Amino acid sequence: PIVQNLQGQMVHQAISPRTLNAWVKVVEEKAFSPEVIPMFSALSEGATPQDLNTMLNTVGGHQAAMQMLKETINEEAAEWDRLHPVHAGPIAPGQMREPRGSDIAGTTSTLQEQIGWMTHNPPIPVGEIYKRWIILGLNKIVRMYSPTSILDIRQGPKEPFRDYVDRFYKTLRAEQASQEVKNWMTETLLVQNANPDCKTILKALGPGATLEEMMTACQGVGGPGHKARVL
Amino acid sequence: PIVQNLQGQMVHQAISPRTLNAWVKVVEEKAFSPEVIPMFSALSEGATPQDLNTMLNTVGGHQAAMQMLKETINEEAAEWDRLHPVHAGPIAPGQMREPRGSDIAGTTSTLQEQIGWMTHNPPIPVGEIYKRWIILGLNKIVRMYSPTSILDIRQGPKEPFRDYVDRFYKTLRAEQASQEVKNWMTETLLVQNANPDCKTILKALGPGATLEEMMTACQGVGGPGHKARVL
Amino acid sequence: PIVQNLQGQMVHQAISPRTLNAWVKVVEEKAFSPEVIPMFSALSEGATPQDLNTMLNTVGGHQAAMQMLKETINEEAAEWDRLHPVHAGPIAPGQMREPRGSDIAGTTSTLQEQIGWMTHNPPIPVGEIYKRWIILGLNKIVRMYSPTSILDIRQGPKEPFRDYVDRFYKTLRAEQASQEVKNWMTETLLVQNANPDCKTILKALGPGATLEEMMTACQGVGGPGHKARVL
Amino acid sequence: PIVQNLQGQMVHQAISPRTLNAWVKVVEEKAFSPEVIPMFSALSEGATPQDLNTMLNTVGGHQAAMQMLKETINEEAAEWDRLHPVHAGPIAPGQMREPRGSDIAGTTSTLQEQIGWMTHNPPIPVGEIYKRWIILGLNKIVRMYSPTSILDIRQGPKEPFRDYVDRFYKTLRAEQASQEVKNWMTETLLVQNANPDCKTILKALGPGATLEEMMTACQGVGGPGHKARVL
Amino acid sequence: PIVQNLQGQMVHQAISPRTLNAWVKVVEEKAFSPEVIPMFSALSEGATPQDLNTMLNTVGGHQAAMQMLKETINEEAAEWDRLHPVHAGPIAPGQMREPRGSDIAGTTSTLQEQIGWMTHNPPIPVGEIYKRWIILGLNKIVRMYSPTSILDIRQGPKEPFRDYVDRFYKTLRAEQASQEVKNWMTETLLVQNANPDCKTILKALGPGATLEEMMTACQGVGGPGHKARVL
Amino acid sequence: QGPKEPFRDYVDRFYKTLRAEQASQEVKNWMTETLLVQNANPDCKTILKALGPGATLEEMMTACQGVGGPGHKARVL
């Protein structure tokens, strides 16, 4: 990845072996889990596209989903090529002819070519753009991973409040919805998908109370509430 | 976070993957433990909001607790904007414009501009207030987790003094109240929750005996309040 | 190996000891997997023959595969020497005496003179061609471990679409044949070996379906055709 | 080792503990197995006699075997005073003097002096010969391979082709004979030590077949060779 | 300890937790073995007395030998004081009062004082004198550690040659006597206490020869030797 | 070499098959050195081992004549 600042101009240096192996181990046990999307951003320091392509090409046994992500990245590349300012093709001598949609990715451009417009000309943030296109494909994969749909989720009569809340919040991560819509859904969904025992104390707490306040009261009641022999 | 000073100007540096693994791993083993709250503060050198939001967003199973913490952060941010000193509307020419409560949060703010208000014009301690709000949310989380009260922690007939004192102090970590008030209560609580036979040594020392003095006496009697080594 | 640019002339830095440990460890967990082939190139910091050769010599288990790869390299080196433009007679003093097939290889070359022709004079791709030949040999090695052929990829009466897709993707990584033909083949191969119930729901999608469109349809169906039972 | 050139004259840098750990681990996992020799060579960067001798001295349980290696190093050293130039006795003031066979090792040399003839006046190849002497002695440790011979390797009735190949390549590294002799012998050996069931298809494939061709062909043959019915 | 030279004069910088763990792990799993003496030498980078004393006091459960080691060092410090006393007492102003016999120990000398006489004036390697005494104590300790005397080296009837030669050379690690003595007993002892079957082979090999030849002859024979007699 | 087969019958078999070896002289010399020890029966292999490294056919034949039969049946007690 591109590194170095204090010791002068940026230099692309190789990915550390430990980081590559550590990433593979995370992928084994957190294969399609929503937690991977912020982890990927944190781990991938230095915006070089070749390294990002290398990370997606080194995936093991359960790789299949990653080729859909690559096809999605190509759709975004096609969007850059034709649905954004297209360009003539020929350029006036003295300019590096500027990247095409597929040149953003590893498909038609090499490491030396990409690095050239990242430091020998005013920077083009190709790695940020390529990474953003990867994140857009990752949103689809986490959405498809999801086991049960929100209307088919319901709290059992032998199911605690802790688990019911945990099932909802874990499932909510894969939705890909906006904050305003998520807040609207959350307010009624808790009452709507509840069991009768939980609903008995929840309706008593009722509208107005925020997440923490409802949770504080509900945790105090405990388990699946009424008569669950918790004392 | 933004680092460097001895080497010249400050630069925003991405967090280590080792630090991220250590955070994920302690969350995997000690998920809701009170030991996490001092540990998080010690780990988080440079409280830059974007990086802090990423650490919360990379948490596994207990997403519901994290979202309750996020609502607490929104509640504190809203409180800062409305109830803590207000800042004027139309900013003066050539100034960076002081952030509002919403701008403190990584969720509703962008990095380049955020680095600018934290490095150009006079210091704004946005990281420290954001960290304090996170610590307050963590204090709320240990309260949700706790299954028993400090009045319910009591020594069994065959349970050692060592086992009892450990439970009492582990439980005490999440009891949040005034130190002067806690001290005043504690003298009764230590004798109150001990088993009858083992309570005898605590009673024998009487008024003015501190935990060191009690522990020193407890070296001789040993175990669950045993008959002494020499009769 | 040879790396450094902005901070001065290139220096032949030795490989990390972790790289040696990781190389043995990856072989221990997954010796014949195709995922090792891109991973090997990510650990290459200057493709200098002598240190790249050390990786081949440190393998234990599947020694026969490595020895076969070495036999293949001898043929590729000979192909460069004889089937590609032949090397002329005696040269004058002060020249680097143009590399032949066995000079590119570590077997008849010395490291000091190898570095000399490689980069003391304008760069020559001696390490790059050697690295590329190794990838060609690695393709043969992973291709001899796969039991099932493309016609033997089937779906049972109780096998879900996701497992069938996973087997197809695992097989896709073992292809080693023309990409354009393979893509154009992929369009009809999946529906061919699908059982009537599976085939019937797949037939509804029709010609020219994209990978995302196909996966979206597959995600909806899930099971071994549309409507599960006893599993 | 002594390193640095572009950043100033070379300085002695102590070897990292992880290098010794890798050497000990290799010995722990597979004591005298052939993998140790390139691992030792890989970690012998710089090649200063004192630094190289640390690995020889750090071996635990198997240090008695290393006494023979130490004897071999002294045998090669005795030869440096005999088969190689004997030099002369009176070397006049102002020289670092071309060392004797016994001066190569740390036993008769002081580190400052040893480093002195490696960079103060034109470098002496002390590390090159010392590293080679250790490799030559390690190349005699192959003799210690208890109950291991090519003549004992005969494939059983229910033993797969891959087991036979594994056994053949395991003892192949212990041959210690010339490459031409190995090739001439190899043609007979491959068919000779095979079981009758797998030998039958090798006979059908017949003369003029290379190692790659035979190994590639045998993938589709399966197990100990195609099994018949019990009727 | 004192480290580096590239940035300027050496800096007193504490050891890595990884380095500290390596020392604890080696001592816990290999105790007081002769292999720990070169390991300690390689794990003690930078000759600062305080840090060397700290290494001895940070050892795990088995510290009895460590206390004896410090006691033997204390006697050596007393020997050093009386060995050099000509400069004892008053000196001309501008001299750092110099290290006396007890000041070689980190316990008697303050840290700023240690660093001052190490790094300002022409180097006095006080930590290397302290380490020489530690190595001397370790040399005493291995003799105590040895579970057998050299007079009790013998081979049982079902005991193999590999164990007998290994025991003899392992014992020679702790003998302390000059290398001539070790060579001298090797010439005559081996045929004396070998088991009847092995003893016949050693006797039959007869006068002269070297360990490589003896080892080679012993390897063909195998195990505790053939049961039947020869001539 | 068989159980009751002596060195003379065995060496004759080896030289008979070595006539049709059809390989380089250098390879034949390398094989010649180790084949007699490798293919000898346990009892008769002992003299070949006893002579050890650097042996010549003249020395080996001298030794083989003196040990006789299909090898002496080695004592234990």
The CATH number of whichever domain residue D205 belongs to comes to: 1.10.1200.30
Q: Does F77 reside within a domain?
A: no
Chain D contact present for F32, CB below 8 A: no
Q: Are residues B164 and B138 in the same domain?
A: no
Is the dihedral angle over the CA atoms C149, C150, C156, C162 positive or is it negative?
Answer: positive
Q: Give kind and range of the element (H or E) at residue B3.
A: strand B2-3
Nearest chain D alpha carbon to E34:
D60
Q: Which of D7, D15, D68 is facing E6, going by the closest CB pair?
A: D7
Q: Do the Cβ atoms of A42 and B58 come within 8 Å?
A: yes
Nearest chain B alpha carbon to A218:
B144
Alpha helical stretches, state H, chain D = 17-30, 36-42, 49-58, 63-80, 111-119, 126-138, 161-172, 179-192, 196-205, 211-218
Supply angle C-alpha B57, B59, B61, rounded to 5: 125
Q: Does E156 reside within a domain?
A: yes
Substitution target in A2, A5, A10, A11 with the highest count of C β-carbons within 10 Å is A11
Closest-CA distance, E127 to chain F, in angstroms, reads 54
Q: Which of B15, B140, B144 is facing A42, going by the closest CB pair?
A: B15
- Residue that is written with structure tokens 């989380």 in the block: B141
Q: Rounded distance, CA A141 to CA A76, Å?
A: 16
Closest-CA distance, F43 to chain E, in angstroms, reads 10
Which tokens in the block code for residue A103?
């040149």
Chain D contact present for F24, CB below 8 A: yes
Which tokens in the block code for residue F47?
């003299």
- Residues 131-160 in E contacting F (C-alpha not used; CB under 8 Å): none
DSSP conformation class of C5: S
C-beta contacts of B13-21 below 8 A and 24+ residues apart: B14/A42, B14/A45, B15/A42, B15/B51, B15/B54, B15/B55, B17/A19, B17/A22, B17/A42, B17/A43, B19/B43, B20/A39, B20/A42, B20/A43, B20/B55, B20/B58, B21/A22
Q: Rounded distance, CA B92 to CA B96, Å?
A: 9
Q: Are residues C88 and C183 in the same domain?
A: no
Substitution target in D150, D185, D187 with the highest count of F β-carbons within 10 Å is D185
Q: Are residues C168 and C127 in the same domain?
A: no
- Given B122, B147, B172, the domain boundary residue is B147
Q: Rounded distance, CA A95 to CA A93, Å?
A: 6
Residue B23 three-state SS: helix
DSSP code string of chain A: -EE-STTSS-EE-PPPHHHHHHHHHHHHHSSS-TTHHHHHHHH--S--HHHHHHHHHS--TTTTHHHHHHHHHHHHHHIIIIIS----S---TTS-----GGGSSTTT--HHHHHHHHHSSS---HHHHHHHHHHHHHHHHHHHH--S-GGG----TT--HHHHHHHHHHHHTTS---HHHHHHHHHHHHHHT--HHHHHHHHHH-TT--HHHHHHHHHHH-TTSTT----
Q: Are residues B11 and B113 in the same domain?
A: yes
**Nearest Cα residue to A197 out of A176, A223, A168:** A223
Please tell me the number of Cα atoms within 13 Å of A193 on its side-chain side.
21
Q: Does C77 reside within a domain?
A: yes
Which tokens in the block code for residue B171?
């439980």
Burial of E158 (C-beta count, 10 Å sphere; 0-12/13-18/19+): exposed
C-beta contacts of D150-155 below 8 A and 24+ residues apart: D150/D175, D150/D189, D151/F38, D153/D193, D154/D193, D154/D195, D155/D193, D155/D194, D155/D195, D155/D198, D155/D224
Are residues D197 and D160 in contact, defined by beta-carbon separation less than 8 angstroms?
no
- Given D118, D147, D176, the domain boundary residue is D147
* β strands within chain C, DSSP E: 2-3, 11-12
- Residues 191-210 in C contacting A (C-alpha not used; CB under 8 Å): 210
Nearest chain D alpha carbon to F28:
D181
Q: Are residues C137 and C89 in the same domain?
A: yes
All residues of chain B having their beta carbon less than 8 Å from the beta carbon of residue A216 are 143-144
Measured distance between the N- and C-terminal CA atoms of chain A, rounded to whole angstroms: 57
Q: Rounded distance, CA C55 to CA C20, Å?
A: 8
Chain F contact present for D184, CB below 8 A: yes
All residues of chain A having their beta carbon less than 8 Å from the beta carbon of residue C212 are 68, 71-72, 140
Are residues E12 and E1 in contact, defined by beta-carbon separation less than 8 angstroms?
yes
In sequence order, the 6+-apart residues with CB closer than 8 A to the CB of B172 are B150
Q: Give kind and range of the element (H or E) at residue C169.
A: helix C161-172
Burial of C14 (C-beta count, 10 Å sphere; 0-12/13-18/19+): middle
Closest-CA distance, F23 to chain D, in angstroms, reads 9
Q: Do the Cβ atoms of A20 and C35 come within 8 Å?
A: no
- Residues 85-124 in A contacting B (C-alpha not used; CB under 8 Å): none
Q: Are residues C126 and C175 in the same domain?
A: no
Q: Does F76 reside within a domain?
A: no
Q: Are residues B11 and B120 in the same domain?
A: yes
Q: Give kind and range of the element (H or E) at residue C28.
A: helix C17-30
Q: Are residues D135 and D152 in the same domain?
A: no
Chain E contact present for F74, CB below 8 A: yes
Closest-CA distance, F15 to chain D, in angstroms, reads 19
Q: Which of C21, C72, C144 is facing D22, going by the closest CB pair?
A: C21
**What domain count does chain C have?**
2
Q: Does B178 reside within a domain?
A: yes
DSSP conformation class of C2: E
- Residue that is written with structure tokens 């088995």 in the block: E62
All residues of chain D having their beta carbon less than 8 Å from the beta carbon of residue E18 are 17
Q: Point out which residues pair with D11 in neighbouring strands.
A: D3
Q: Does F31 reside within a domain?
A: yes
Closest-CA distance, D76 to chain E, in angstroms, reads 13
Three-state SS across A203-228? HHHCCCCCHHHHHHHHHHHCCCCCCC
Q: Are residues A203 and A110 in the same domain?
A: no
How far is Cα of residue B166 from the mean position of the Cα atoms in its chain? 19
Q: Are residues B119 and B180 in the same domain?
A: no
Q: Does B128 reside within a domain?
A: yes
Are residues A125 and A188 in contact, defined by beta-carbon separation less than 8 angstroms?
no
DSSP code string of A32-48: S-TTHHHHHHHH--S--
Chains near F with 3+ CB pairs less than 8 A apart are D, E
Annotate D108-128 with b (16+ C-beta within 10 A) or e (fewer): ebeeeebbebbeeeeebebbe
DSSP conformation class of B112: H
- Given E88, E118, E147, the domain boundary residue is E147
**Nearest Cα residue to F1 out of F29, F55, F42, F48:** F42
All residues of chain D having their beta carbon less than 8 Å from the beta carbon of residue E166 are 64-65
Which tokens in the block code for residue D77?
């050293």
Closest-CA distance, B182 to chain A, in angstroms, reads 23
Residue B2 three-state SS: strand
Chain E contact present for F77, CB below 8 A: no
Alpha helical stretches, state H, chain B = 17-30, 36-43, 49-57, 63-83, 101-104, 111-117, 126-145, 161-172, 179-192, 196-205, 211-221
Three-state SS across chain E? CEECCCCCCCEECCCCHHHHHHHHHHHHHHCCCCCHHHHHHHHCCCCCHHHHHHHHHCCCCCCHHHHHHHHHHHHHHHHHHHHCCCCCCCCCCCCCCCCCHHHHCCCCCCHHHHHHHHHCCCCCCHHHHHHHHHHHHHHHHHHHHCCCCHHHCCCCCCCCHHHHHHHHHHHHCCCCCCHHHHHHHHHHHHHHHCCHHHHHHHHHHCCCCCHHHHHHHHHHHCCCCCCCCCC
Q: Does B227 reside within a domain?
A: no
Touching pair A, C by Cβ (3+ pairs < 8 Å): yes
Chain A contact present for C186, CB below 8 A: no
Q: Report the structure determination method.
A: NMR
Which tokens in the block code for residue F40?
């000898």
Chain A contact present for C170, CB below 8 A: yes
Are residues A195 and A155 in contact, defined by beta-carbon separation less than 8 angstroms?
yes
Q: Do the Cβ atoms of F30 and D181 come within 8 Å?
A: yes
Please tell me the number of Cα atoms within 13 Å of B55 on its side-chain side.
27
Which tokens in the block code for residue B76?
């504190």
Q: Point out which residues pair with D3 in neighbouring strands.
A: D11
Q: Rounded distance, CA F20 to CA C227, Å?
A: 73
Are residues B186 and B209 in contact, defined by beta-carbon separation less than 8 angstroms?
no
For chain A, give the number of residues. Answer: 231
Q: Rounded distance, CA B130 to CA B46, Å?
A: 11
Burial of B230 (C-beta count, 10 Å sphere; 0-12/13-18/19+): exposed
Q: Do the Cβ atoms of C38 and A15 come within 8 Å?
A: no
Annotate D190-219 with b (16+ C-beta within 10 A) or e (fewer): bbebbbebbbebbeeeeeeeeebebbeebe
Supply angle C-alpha E51, E53, E55, rounded to 5: 70
Touching pair E, A by Cβ (3+ pairs < 8 Å): no
Q: Are residues B165 and B90 in the same domain?
A: no
**Nearest Cα residue to F22 out of D208, D192, D168, D188:** D188
Q: Are residues A94 and A125 in the same domain?
A: yes
Please tell me the number of Cα atoms within 13 Å of D160 on its side-chain side.
10
Chains near D with 3+ CB pairs less than 8 A apart are C, E, F
Backbone angles phi, psi at E11, to 5 degrees: -115, 140
Tell me the count of A-C CB pairs closer than 8 A. 61
All residues of chain E having their beta carbon less than 8 Å from the beta carbon of residue F76 are 227-229
Structural domain range at position E195? 148-221
- Provide the CATH number for the domain around residue D92: 1.10.375.10
